[PDB]
Amino acid sequence: CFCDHYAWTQWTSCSKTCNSGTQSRHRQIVVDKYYQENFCEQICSKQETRECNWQRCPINC
Numbered sequence: 001c002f003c004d005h006y007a008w009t010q011w012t013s014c015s016k017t018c019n020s021g022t023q024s025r026h027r028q029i030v031v032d033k034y035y036q037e038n039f040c041e042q043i044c045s046k047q048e049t050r051e052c053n054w055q056r057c058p059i060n061c
């Protein structure tokens, strides 16, 4: 199967704007012919999670 057939969504808003926040995206999947036929469920990665804004929040006096 071609996993790139079903496009990924956009990276969501960073949970924490600083101090190592997290964000995630996922493929856009609608149940149809190509999906069930080509076994796109088992051999494809449907999610990608990443840490965002790992720079420490500025410490002010």
Ligand SMILES: *[C@@H]1O[C@H](CO)[C@@H](O)[C@H](O)[C@@H]1O
Binding pocket: 003, 004, 005, 006, 007, 008, 009
């Ligand atoms: C994951 O989704 C992104 C969004 O368009 C593409 O760049 C990529 O080819 C993949 O299928």
Ligand SMILES: *[C@@H]1O[C@@H](C)[C@@H](O)[C@@H](O)[C@@H]1O
Binding pocket: 016, 017, 018, 057, 058
């Ligand atoms: C989010 O964004 C960064 C740039 C800082 O201003 C932080 O104070 C805030 O939590």
